[PDB]
Paper text:
It consists of an ectodomain comprised of the S1 receptor-binding subunit and the S2 membrane fusion subunit, a transmembrane domain, and a short intracellular tail. The CTD directly engages the cellular receptor, human angiotensin-converting enzyme 2 (ACE2), and functions as the receptor-binding domain ([name]). Moreover, we captured an ensemble of cryo-EM structures of [name]-[name]-2 S trimer in complex with the Fab of [name] or 3C1 up to 3.8 Å resolution, revealing the [name]-triggered stepwise allosteric rearrangements of the S trimer to coordinate the binding of neutralizing antibodies targeting the [name]-[name]-2 [name], also providing structural basis for MAbs [name] and 3C1 as noncompeting antibody cocktail.
To investigate the molecular basis of [name]-mediated neutralization of [name]-[name]-2, we resolved four cryo-EM structures of the stabilized [name]-[name]-2 trimeric [name] in complex with [name] Fab in distinct conformational states, termed S-[name]-F1 (associated with one Fab), S-[name]-F2 (with two Fabs), and S-[name]-F3a/S-[name]-F3b (with three Fabs). Among these structures, S-[name]-F3a and S-[name]-F2 were better resolved to 3.8 and 4.3 Å resolution, respectively. In the S-[name]-F1/S-[name]-F2 structures, there are one/two [name] in the up configuration with each bound with a [name] Fab, while the remaining [name] are in the down conformation without Fab binding. Thus, once [name]-1 bound with a Fab, the resulting outward tilt of [name]-1 could break the allosteric constrains originally imposed on [name]-2, leading to an up configuration of [name]-2. Consequently, the original steric hindrance could be released to allow [name]-3 to expose its buried epitope and also leave enough space to accommodate the binding of the third [name] Fab. Indeed, we observed a further 12.4° outward tilt of [name]-2, releasing the space for the third Fab.
Author numbering:
A (entry chain c): 1 to 214
B (entry chain B): 341 to 582
C (entry chain d): 1 to 218
D (entry chain A): 14 to 69, 78 to 247, 255 to 291
Write the structure that this text describes.
Amino acid sequence: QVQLKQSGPSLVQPSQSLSITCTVSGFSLTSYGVHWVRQSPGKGLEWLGVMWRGGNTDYNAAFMSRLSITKDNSKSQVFFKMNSLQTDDTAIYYCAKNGGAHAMDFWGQGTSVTVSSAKTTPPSVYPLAPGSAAQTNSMVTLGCLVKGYFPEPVTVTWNSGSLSSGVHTFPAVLQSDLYTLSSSVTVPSSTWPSETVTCNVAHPASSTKVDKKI
Amino acid sequence: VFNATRFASVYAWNRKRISNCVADYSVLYNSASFSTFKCYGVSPTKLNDLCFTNVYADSFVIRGDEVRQIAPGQTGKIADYNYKLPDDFTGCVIAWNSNNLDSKVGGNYNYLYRLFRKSNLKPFERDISTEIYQAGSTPCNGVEGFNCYFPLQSYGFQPTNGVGYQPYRVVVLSFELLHAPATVCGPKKSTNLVKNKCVNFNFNGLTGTGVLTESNKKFLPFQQFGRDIADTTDAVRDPQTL
Amino acid sequence: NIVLTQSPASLAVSLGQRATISCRASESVDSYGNSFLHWYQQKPGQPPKLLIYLASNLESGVPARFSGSGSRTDFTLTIDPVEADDAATYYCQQNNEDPFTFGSGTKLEIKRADAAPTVSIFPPSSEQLTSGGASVVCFLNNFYPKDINVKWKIDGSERQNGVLNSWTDQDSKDSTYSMSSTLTLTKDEYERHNSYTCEATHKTSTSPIVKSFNRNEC
Amino acid sequence: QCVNLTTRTQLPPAYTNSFTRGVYYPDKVFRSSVLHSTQDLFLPFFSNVTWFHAIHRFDNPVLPFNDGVYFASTEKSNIIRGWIFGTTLDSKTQSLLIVNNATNVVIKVCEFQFCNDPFLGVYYHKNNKSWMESEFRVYSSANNCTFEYVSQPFLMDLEGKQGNFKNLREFVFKNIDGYFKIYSKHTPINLVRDLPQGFSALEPLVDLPIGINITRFQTLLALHRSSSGWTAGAAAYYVGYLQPRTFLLKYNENGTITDAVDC
């Protein structure tokens, strides 16, 4: 129903500018002002700015001189003009619906902004299966290796998200123009090797979908 | 108002003016269908057989823990900025569940309520204005932003809410009785009929004790009871069929 | 410049107790009729979401355990009773004065009993060895507290160049910790020596976590 | 609206003498074959009452309602359409409006902003008559309504007829603790002059528990034209002021009041 996902940017380089467009769904753009935050650069959440109901913009002390918000009422789209991006500005930008007292009641998925001129690298998706000499206790441990991919975002799950209790996903490490991601799951012997288990990996940054049977 | 198709907000309630009719209030109190039925200053069973000048039914929705704010001698954001009742409010506040009635797929976020107002509302004062007011001495001059809060807040409506977070269809019955004619009353009990025996009676116009009989006496349909030469109780019109 | 000094950085509270996440502010108060802040909750695998606005109002969909209050400078978030599905990072938001900054974020953790980590090694598949790479992964999951140090030790010589750990914070429902240790090697390095061992030292586990495997065990 | 009629011929306020009219049942006490002495607002017998005409002379003045008013209407074309009651007859306070547009008897209490001259208009009264009403200029708007009543549908004779007076409609309006008691009586007649010399008791019509202060009143009249060049048919009404005097009520064997006596 409510969708506030971000799209638009193709390549974010350092000391350059590029616009980000956040989708507006579930409410009228002229009624609520889209808020902007980034994904915890070090300490907790940080504020970027807020757009008025068709008026002006407010920004943070650190991001006023670097970032700017532009409201397009003709296209019903919220633009976010970035300027003078550095290597430390790599983070996920989020949009939110305005509450009463400038709150953020609803949240979107956003987009992963990585400040680097490196070329796109596809993921080295391979399964982490137990060996022939591996032991078991009536349950098997399976994993998937998504290493050497760039840039963010990326999706990893098990059987398109069939299980959610025993599924665990690890955070992606911010390497030099690279990322390392992995996952793990605890399933019984009746589900593997008795049944087929497939790890679904999708890389929206490169639009690559690699499936590997364990 | 109790079976309304749509219930309005706490600040834009649908006020139904009841006048020139009868209505039983104990029929709903002992119905075992509504959750809350609390009257202030008078029991709901006592006012069932008492007339009033006017009766207003204010239909709106609030949460479980918010019903305490709508009462005499109680403060709150909804009680000060949306719907202020007087400290001597002698009315009633009826409420019942609404999760299986007003909910929809994904939740009903259409209800709203005001968090703040420039001034406190007077007793029985409705306000449907959405004017954006300023926090301090630096006004935003119109649109929202820069310490200019929007007056209305979104209302969460999910099926897995708690007992305090559950919305309730509230219907506040504000009663008033003044020197003006009492236009609102309640119905009476059933009727009986026994003839040829000295028995007590209470008809629509009078009461007393007498013997009920039948005869060929005429009576003007535009009258209720008759009197004799000495102004004594004489033949009367049946409140039922003529 | 509004810097919300949100303290403490984390909490070790057991089930059924009352957790206290404070949030200090400097500017400002008396906006309309209060000066409270908005509180949020971000899990390790979910974006943040609004729990309570202005620390004194009701919100549907969230459990009743979330409450709070606050003075003109110090604001308090109250979580009572602490259940087994509220392990996440909480924040506070300034709204009564520009900039609308946020706090540093307090990691509310469920104080469970100490436990040792598991051990399981995953040598590379036939496809990886055929291409030329050799990625070994040693998972240490279901442990408490977060104090864990994993070090790959090749039997010829300890390797600390291609090692890399991905430590996951305490999940919401799963009240234990999890970390994935990886090691990037080629087919020549994997075929160099026969036996390879995944070593690690945990605070709870008095005995060292040691599991050896051979290159032919696949 | 603010359109004043030009066909109104300025003539002095003629009056007549009621013989014994203005008597009604003062309460719901049924009696038969007795003389009931009681003090209530009745018209003194052989008293002077005004004479207003509604013809192509058209009187509709603002007359007082301090003590009590009695109505009598001799009509041959059914020109009467309703009455207006209030303190100042404007939207400053509540005003009781009674309307009879030959389809429904509407009785409402609002802040009616009455026009300079309320009336209803019958169009094309000469050729292709049809006796249809389409103009409704009783008031402009209304606010803060406290009472509303609408009768069942019907059809009143809108035929403008000539000859002698054939309809004698008499009403009484008083206030008792806000309970406005309205009376009515319709009987046929054959009259060519002022009010007839006879007797007739008026019965209760309705009881309106409104509770307003009334000091003035007006009367609705129907016009005809084939809004200043409008004329009226053939009808006249009378106004009599009530007084709290003692009167006897001669109830017959059937229980209806056939005669009365003044004090």
